[PDB]
């Protein structure tokens, strides 16, 4: 075997402690680049002029932040969707002022995470598994694409991409609500159903399997020693679990087929989070949540407020305050 052939064999080897693979050849350098830049920036980057109004926002620990307030700040509104690599700046000082690290990080991260998804297909193939774990991971991936790429494209600026920080995340959410009424959008509502339901079904499945573990241990030892890695026999009694849950609700509301049960566990949160991702990706083009402002009117024509109008009052508060120095004209059109 020649050099190339042996290299290919190593790359695709099923015996590496961490699988590399062809997607891995792209994933590894991009995730390392994104990680290293992120850490340095989160610790040490100077304030960034996110909104292009020469009002730099401090995101880093050394510049007066803590873990909760700290962020890698999105690139300047002056840049918009322009590609802003290091070599486009006159200097690192300029690059930093204008939020160059944000673009470097998100572009490397999105590529690496796309390759993380590809890698999951790839190893499944090498191991003779079925191939769809990567399809499950497409839900969170799509959501990352939504907030870091699609939304900025729709709005015309990476300054409106989600910040890489805890408080910056909340800022993104509040402004999003003000401008799109996301709470009143059915795709976000589906998303909530997906995550609330995913948590519910997680607790459900966890509790039901744990409830029906077959006695294999003494009182003084952890029941977990009752299962041995790679044993052929199932470790709990599904018929007993079904007998319980079918009686909790009714028989035909409970699963007795483990494969069907686990498919449901996969599909519920995944589909919900797909819709969440699509909410953000379509509000990116300003098709917003339901608007029932002044929908209920009396015989004379007096507006009779609903909870929708109270939501509206909250949204107006966010709207008028956000980016308080950025707007010169009466409408916030992007």
């Amino acid at each position: 075997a020649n050099l190339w052939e042996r290299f290919c064999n190593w790359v695709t080897s099923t015996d590496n402690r961490l699988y590399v693979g062809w997607f891995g050849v792209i994933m590894i350098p991009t995730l390392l680049a994104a990680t290293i830049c992120f850490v340095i920036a989160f610790i040490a980057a100077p304030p960034v002029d996110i909104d292009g109004i020469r009002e730099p926002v401090s995101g880093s620990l050394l510049y007066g932040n803590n873990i909760i307030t700290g962020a890698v700040v999105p690139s300047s509104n002056a840049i918009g969707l322009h590609f802003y690599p290091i070599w486009e700046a006159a200097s690192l000082d300029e690059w930093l002022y204008n939020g160059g690290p944000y673009q470097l990080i998100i572009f490397h991260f999105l590529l690496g995470a796309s390759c993380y998804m590809g890698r999951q297909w790839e190893l499944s193939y090498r191991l003779g598994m079925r191939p769809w774990i990567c399809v499950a991971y497409s839900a969170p991936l799509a959501s990352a694409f939504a907030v870091f790429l699609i939304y900025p494209i729709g709005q015309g600026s990476f300054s409106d991409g989600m910040p890489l920080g805890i408080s910056g995340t909340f800022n993104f959410m509040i402004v999003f609500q003000a401008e799109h009424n996301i709470l009143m959008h059915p795709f976000h509502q589906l998303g909530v159903a997906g995550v609330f339901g995913g948590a519910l079904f997680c607790a459900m499945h966890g509790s039901l399997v744990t409830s029906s573990l077959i006695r294999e241990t003494t009182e003084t030892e952890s029941a977990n020693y009752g299962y041995k890695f790679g044993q052929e026999e199932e470790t709990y009694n599904i018929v007993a679990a079904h007998g319980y849950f079918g009686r909790l609700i009714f028989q035909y509301a409970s699963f007795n087929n483990s494969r069907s049960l686990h498919f449901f566990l996969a599909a519920w949160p995944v589909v919900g989070v797909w819709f969440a991702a699509l909410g953000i990706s379509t509000m990116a083009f300003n098709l917003n949540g339901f608007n029932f402002n002044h929908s209920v009117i009396d015989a004379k024509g007096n507006v009779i407020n609903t909870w929708a109008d109270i939501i509206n009052r909250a949204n107006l508060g966010m709207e008028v305050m956000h980016e308080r120095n950025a707007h010169n004209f009466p409408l916030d059109l992007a």
């Binding site: 009396d298 015989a299 009779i304």
Partner: protein, 80 residues
């Protein structure tokens, strides 16, 4: 099985639909009339489109007293 007749058996039977081609529409029509006669408004105390405000009033009839709340609403309804 737990003993009760299967739902599929029941809802495909002639005797079920003989009974329910009557009970279902009757209940639907009863509900319709609950609203159409205006009885729903009076049972629950829900204002009609013309009873939210007096003609020149532009102040909401909010309850402000705990134990004289019932009389307050009555007073508000007199003022209509």
């Amino acid at each position: 099985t737990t003993g009760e007749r299967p739902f599929s058996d029941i809802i495909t039977s002639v005797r079920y639909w003989v009974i329910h081609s009557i009970t279902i529409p009757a209940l639907f029509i009863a509900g319709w009339l609950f609203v159409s006669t205006g009885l729903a408004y009076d049972v629950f105390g829900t204002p009609r489109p013309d009873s939210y405000y007096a003609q020149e009033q532009r102040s909401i009839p909010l309850v402000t007293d705990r134990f004289e709340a019932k009389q307050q609403v009555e007073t508000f309804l007199e003022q209509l």
